[PDB]
Amino acid sequence: STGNRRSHALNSTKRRWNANLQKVRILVDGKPKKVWVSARAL
Amino acid sequence: MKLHELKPAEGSRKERNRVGRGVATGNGKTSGRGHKGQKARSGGGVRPGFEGGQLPLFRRLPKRGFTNINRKEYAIVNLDQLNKFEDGTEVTPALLVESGVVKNEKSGIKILGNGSLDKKLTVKAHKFSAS
Amino acid sequence: NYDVLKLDGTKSGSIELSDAVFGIEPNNSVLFEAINLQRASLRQGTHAVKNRSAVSGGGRKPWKQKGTGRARQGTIRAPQWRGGGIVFGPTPRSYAYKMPKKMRRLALRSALSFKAQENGLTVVDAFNFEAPKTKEFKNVLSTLEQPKKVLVVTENEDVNVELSARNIPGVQVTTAQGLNVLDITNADSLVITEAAAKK
Amino acid sequence: PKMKTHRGAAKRVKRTASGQLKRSRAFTSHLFANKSTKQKRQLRKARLVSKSDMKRVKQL
RNA sequence: AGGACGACAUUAGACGAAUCAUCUGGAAAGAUGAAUCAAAGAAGGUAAUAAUCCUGUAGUCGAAAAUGUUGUCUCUCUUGAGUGGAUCCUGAGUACGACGGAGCACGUGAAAUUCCGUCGGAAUCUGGGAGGACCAUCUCCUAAGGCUAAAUACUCUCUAGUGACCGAUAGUGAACCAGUACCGUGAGGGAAAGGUGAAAAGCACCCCGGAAGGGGAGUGAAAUAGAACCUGAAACCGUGUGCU
RNA sequence: AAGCAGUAAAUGUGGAGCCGUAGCGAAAGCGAGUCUGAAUAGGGCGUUUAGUAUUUGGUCGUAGACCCGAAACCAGGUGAU
RNA sequence: GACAAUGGUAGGAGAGCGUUCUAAGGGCGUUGAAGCAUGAUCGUAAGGACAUGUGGAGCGCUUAGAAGUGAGAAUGCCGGUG
Ligand SMILES: [Mg+2]
Ligand SMILES: [Mg+2]
Ligand SMILES: [Mg+2]
Ligand SMILES: [Mg+2]
Ligand SMILES: [Mg+2]
Ligand SMILES: [Mg+2]
Ligand SMILES: [Mg+2]
Ligand SMILES: [Mg+2]
Ligand SMILES: [Mg+2]
Ligand SMILES: [Mg+2]
Ligand SMILES: [Mg+2]
Ligand SMILES: [Mg+2]
Ligand SMILES: [Mg+2]
Ligand SMILES: [Mg+2]
Ligand SMILES: [Mg+2]
Ligand SMILES: [Mg+2]
Ligand SMILES: [Mg+2]
Ligand SMILES: [Mg+2]
Ligand SMILES: [Mg+2]
Ligand SMILES: [Mg+2]
Ligand SMILES: [Mg+2]
Ligand SMILES: [Mg+2]
Ligand SMILES: [Mg+2]
Ligand SMILES: [Mg+2]
Ligand SMILES: [Mg+2]
Ligand SMILES: [Mg+2]
Ligand SMILES: [Mg+2]
Ligand SMILES: [Mg+2]
Ligand SMILES: [Mn+2]
Ligand SMILES: [Mn+2]
Ligand SMILES: [Mn+2]
Ligand SMILES: [Mn+2]
Ligand SMILES: [Mn+2]
Ligand SMILES: [Mn+2]
Ligand SMILES: [Mn+2]
Ligand SMILES: [Mn+2]
Ligand SMILES: [Mn+2]
Ligand SMILES: [Mn+2]
Ligand SMILES: [Mn+2]
Ligand SMILES: [Mn+2]
Ligand SMILES: [Mn+2]
Ligand SMILES: [Mn+2]
Ligand SMILES: [Mn+2]
Ligand SMILES: [Mn+2]
Ligand SMILES: [Mn+2]
Ligand SMILES: [Mn+2]
Ligand SMILES: [Mn+2]
Ligand SMILES: [Mn+2]
Ligand SMILES: [Mn+2]
Ligand SMILES: [Mn+2]
Ligand SMILES: [Mn+2]
Ligand SMILES: [Mn+2]
Ligand SMILES: [Mn+2]
Ligand SMILES: [Mn+2]
Ligand SMILES: [Mn+2]
Ligand SMILES: [Mn+2]
Ligand SMILES: [Mn+2]
Ligand SMILES: [Mn+2]
Ligand SMILES: [Mn+2]
Ligand SMILES: [Mn+2]
Ligand SMILES: [Mn+2]
Ligand SMILES: [Mn+2]
Ligand SMILES: [Mn+2]
Ligand SMILES: [Mn+2]
Ligand SMILES: [Mn+2]
Ligand SMILES: [Mn+2]
Ligand SMILES: [Mn+2]
Ligand SMILES: [Mn+2]
Ligand SMILES: [Mn+2]
Ligand SMILES: [Mn+2]
Ligand SMILES: [Mn+2]
Ligand SMILES: [Mn+2]
Ligand SMILES: [Mn+2]
Ligand SMILES: [Mn+2]
Ligand SMILES: [Mn+2]
Ligand SMILES: [Mn+2]
Numbered sequence: 001s002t003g004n005r006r007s008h009a010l011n012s013t014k015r016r017w018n019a020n021l022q023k024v025r026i027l028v029d030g031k032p033k034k035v036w037v038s039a040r041a042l
Numbered sequence: 043m044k045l046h047e048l049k050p051a052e053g054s055r056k057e058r059n060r061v062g063r064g065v066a067t068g069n070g071k072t073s074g075r076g077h078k079g080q081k082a083r084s085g086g087g088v089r090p091g092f093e094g095g096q097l098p099l100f101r102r103l104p105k106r107g108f109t110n111i112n113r114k115e116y117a118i119v120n121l122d123q124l125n126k127f128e129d130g131t132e133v134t135p136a137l138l139v140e141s142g143v144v145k146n147e148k149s150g151i152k153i154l155g156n157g158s159l160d161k162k163l164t165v166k167a168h169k170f171s172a173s
Numbered sequence: 174n175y176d177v178l179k180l181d182g183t184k185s186g187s188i189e190l191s192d193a194v195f196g197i198e199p200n201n202s203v204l205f206e207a208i209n210l211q212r213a214s215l216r217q218g219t220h221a222v223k224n225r226s227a228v229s230g231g232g233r234k235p236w237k238q239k240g241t242g243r244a245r246q247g248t249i250r251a252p253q254w255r256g257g258g259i260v261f262g263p264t265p266r267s268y269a270y271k272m273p274k275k276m277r278r279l280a281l282r283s284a285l286s287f288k289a290q291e292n293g294l295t296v297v298d299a300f301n302f303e304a305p306k307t308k309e310f311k312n313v314l315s316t317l318e319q320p321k322k323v324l325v326v327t328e329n330e331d332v333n334v335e336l337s338a339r340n341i342p343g344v345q346v347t348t349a350q351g352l353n354v355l356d357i358t359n360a361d362s363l364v365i366t367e368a369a370a371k372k
Numbered sequence: 373p374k375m376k377t378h379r380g381a382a383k384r385v386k387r388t389a390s391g392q393l394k395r396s397r398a399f400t401s402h403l404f405a406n407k408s409t410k411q412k413r414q415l416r417k418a419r420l421v422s423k424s425d426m427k428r429v430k431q432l
Numbered sequence: 433a434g435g436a437c438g439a440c441a442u443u444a445g446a447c448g449a450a451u452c453a454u455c456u457g458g459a460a461a462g463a464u465g466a467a468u469c470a471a472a473g474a475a476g477g478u479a480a481u482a483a484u485c486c487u488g489u490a491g492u493c494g495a496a497a498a499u500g501u502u503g504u505c506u507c508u509c510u511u512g513a514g515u516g517g518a519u520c521c522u523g524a525g526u527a528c529g530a531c532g533g534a535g536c537a538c539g540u541g542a543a544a545u546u547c548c549g550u551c552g553g554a555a556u557c558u559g560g561g562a563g564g565a566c567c568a569u570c571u572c573c574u575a576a577g578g579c580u581a582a583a584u585a586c587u588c589u590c591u592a593g594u595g596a597c598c599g600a601u602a603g604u605g606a607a608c609c610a611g612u613a614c615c616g617u618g619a620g621g622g623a624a625a626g627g628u629g630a631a632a633a634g635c636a637c638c639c640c641g642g643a644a645g646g647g648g649a650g651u652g653a654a655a656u657a658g659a660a661c662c663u664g665a666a667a668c669c670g671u672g673u674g675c676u
Numbered sequence: 677a678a679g680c681a682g683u684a685a686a687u688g689u690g691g692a693g694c695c696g697u698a699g700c701g702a703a704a705g706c707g708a709g710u711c712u713g714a715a716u717a718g719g720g721c722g723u724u725u726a727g728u729a730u731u732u733g734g735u736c737g738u739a740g741a742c743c744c745g746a747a748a749c750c751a752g753g754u755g756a757u
Numbered sequence: 758g759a760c761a762a763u764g765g766u767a768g769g770a771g772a773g774c775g776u777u778c779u780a781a782g783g784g785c786g787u788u789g790a791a792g793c794a795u796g797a798u799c800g801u802a803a804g805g806a807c808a809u810g811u812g813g814a815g816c817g818c819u820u821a822g823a824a825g826u827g828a829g830a831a832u833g834c835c836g837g838u839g
Binding site for chain 1 (some may be wrong): 526532533534539547548549550551
């Protein structure tokens, strides 16, 4: 969800990045099927 | 003024200059020649090539400031002050009565901050006040 | 300065109208600027014309810049082209402007007193119908163009409307112009007393 | 649009007509010229107010 | 949280005042005579320039129907206040911190106020937050759930108007069967081109000619208005020539 | 001024606001004076009253800002007949 | 009435002419408007009239207002014709 932003470095020049979130395989709750899982939740 | 004989006030109104309409007019280059009398025309805004609109700086500012009534408070009748916001004073961050002129009346000077000489003259007449 | 009020033929009484409204002895320069102002305001500014950014053409370079033997060009819609964009035409805009209040009041007295130094008749009257008796009610002498000034809105009196030269407003009305396109006026009586009251 | 005021005139202050001005070489290299040093005093413009005129001018 | 009895408005319309004569004319609304209406002298039309010739205009009247909006009855749904303070309850991976960002007029800066990712991670009304780092005090609030009309923005469209806006190289690209001829494989680019006359009365008939076109004879106020049609400038092309 | 009223009005309302009647200092602040200064020296700015609203003309700024012209940059498409 | 001054580019300043629209007033027009053409006309200039021919329905004038207000040059754009 979102996270697009600049990546200023040293000279403070900007180039766009992504701010990627953590994710992993999971057993799930709603129906026993493998699912992406947000790390901060577990 | 009879609407077909309107006549505008003497010396008001004068025909605008129209550049670029002929040569006898005195304006066909229009104005300038060869230079940056080009359309963009930017002089620069106020500059040469050596920035003298800057040498060093000195500054700061906090909250303050009053509103001056001089001992020409000799206009109004007798007694009272601050009320004269209905006679002769307008916007007041706070109202100080200064000296200057020479007082000619006996009256209460109910005001915030009295200038010293003014206090001696107002008190030499009769009344004084504070806050 | 007693004005000799009268009613529909024969003389009636008299009234002393204030001399610093009806006897200002007009200041002309203000009256001019007022007239020009009011005309300024009646103008709506609906003229507009399409500059090159606006024209329903494109902006390919019509031909490559060098080696053609033609002049260089930018768009087929640049201003020298037939069909091209207009440079600096009219655009929509405000036209009307403000004037200081006292000047407006000075102007009003000036127009009225101009009307007094020549002629401007008075009459207490009015009726409850709708007739071209008003034309027959210019048995009161009264000339070609004029306004009927009146105390407040008086529909019927106002329906002396479609009689060519006549015009007929209130007194809290009272334009600088209508007043002196006018040639003759007739503040009635109540009204005359109010314009007298609203200096 | 109201003209923007130049902000680099946080460097003068209006007198009565004329603008009072900062001076010269205060701070750095004080290891030189001594009578010079007592040049804490004001300024104006004269020739230059012609150039800077209407920029420090919403400073009234 | 969905539906039954009439007011007004929208979608056809109806009524609507008062002029005649002569001159000039192809034709009069013009001119000059006398008249008249007006809550109607706005506008457009009619053979020239019309308040009274026509369409209308001021004003008045009008809806079987179908939406549309509302007045009020029906229809539902509804128990609103105050004291007391003992133990519960007031939104947990949140507020907040660190790091890399991003947003606040405010460029990391003394940087509060607020969002993102990533690890860390609280308190429990003797509580929590804010008051431009931060701490004490004081004052003001009660985050981490949700909904909420009106004032505001805009005009492809509808009806009614307006303009010291254009008047056919202007004004829409487009007043003409224009996004069309035409051009490109395609996305796409894109013109030129309005005007006979009041009325087609658009030239019966004779003539030269295969026809085109023309001269008579005719229509017309005018065709030296004949259709490639009002006016018809200039470049340019011709015939005649007074002086050379 | 916005707003309210009025026929897209010259026009009544609205005194929030703005400029002006006081200046000087970075400021606290003092005030016909104030700043620097130990100084009641000298010096700087200032006092010896005229402004303010509307507006024709001149000029500047912000806007493409007299007009026509790049080679080029970027974004989104369309093309391997 | 004497008496001075009056070449002039960039450029400053001044007075004006003409165009379209508007307001008010005042007029002209089928017994012929505008436009077009022609003339031996008038004013210091821009520029103004007049008469005749064409044209066949609109137009001046005064005073003030406001402008898409003046072309000979842009290898300018469109049309016509050399
Ligand atoms: Mg500086
Ligand atoms: Mg192209
Ligand atoms: Mg090119
Ligand atoms: Mg006859
Ligand atoms: Mg009426
Ligand atoms: Mg008519
Ligand atoms: Mg093409
Ligand atoms: Mg191709
Ligand atoms: Mg092409
Ligand atoms: Mg011909
Ligand atoms: Mg020859
Ligand atoms: Mg100006
Ligand atoms: Mg733009
Ligand atoms: Mg690209
Ligand atoms: Mg192939
Ligand atoms: Mg002329
Ligand atoms: Mg004539
Ligand atoms: Mg005839
Ligand atoms: Mg000749
Ligand atoms: Mg001639
Ligand atoms: Mg003739
Ligand atoms: Mg003629
Ligand atoms: Mg005709
Ligand atoms: Mg004439
Ligand atoms: Mg004028
Ligand atoms: Mg040329
Ligand atoms: Mg060439
Ligand atoms: Mg050509
Ligand atoms: Mn950047
Ligand atoms: Mn001039
Ligand atoms: Mn010159
Ligand atoms: Mn040049
Ligand atoms: Mn130059
Ligand atoms: Mn220039
Ligand atoms: Mn440019
Ligand atoms: Mn610069
Ligand atoms: Mn474009
Ligand atoms: Mn491009
Ligand atoms: Mn060539
Ligand atoms: Mn165009
Ligand atoms: Mn100050
Ligand atoms: Mn030295
Ligand atoms: Mn009828
Ligand atoms: Mn009728
Ligand atoms: Mn008749
Ligand atoms: Mn007609
Ligand atoms: Mn009606
Ligand atoms: Mn923090
Ligand atoms: Mn941070
Ligand atoms: Mn930031
Ligand atoms: Mn916080
Ligand atoms: Mn604080
Ligand atoms: Mn809560
Ligand atoms: Mn919401
Ligand atoms: Mn419409
Ligand atoms: Mn066109
Ligand atoms: Mn034409
Ligand atoms: Mn093709
Ligand atoms: Mn026709
Ligand atoms: Mn014949
Ligand atoms: Mn005939
Ligand atoms: Mn032809
Ligand atoms: Mn015709
Ligand atoms: Mn023709
Ligand atoms: Mn209103
Ligand atoms: Mn001293
Ligand atoms: Mn001194
Ligand atoms: Mn001094
Ligand atoms: Mn200007
Ligand atoms: Mn300059
Ligand atoms: Mn400019
Ligand atoms: Mn000379
Ligand atoms: Mn000489
Ligand atoms: Mn000049
Ligand atoms: Mn004309
Ligand atoms: Mn032009």
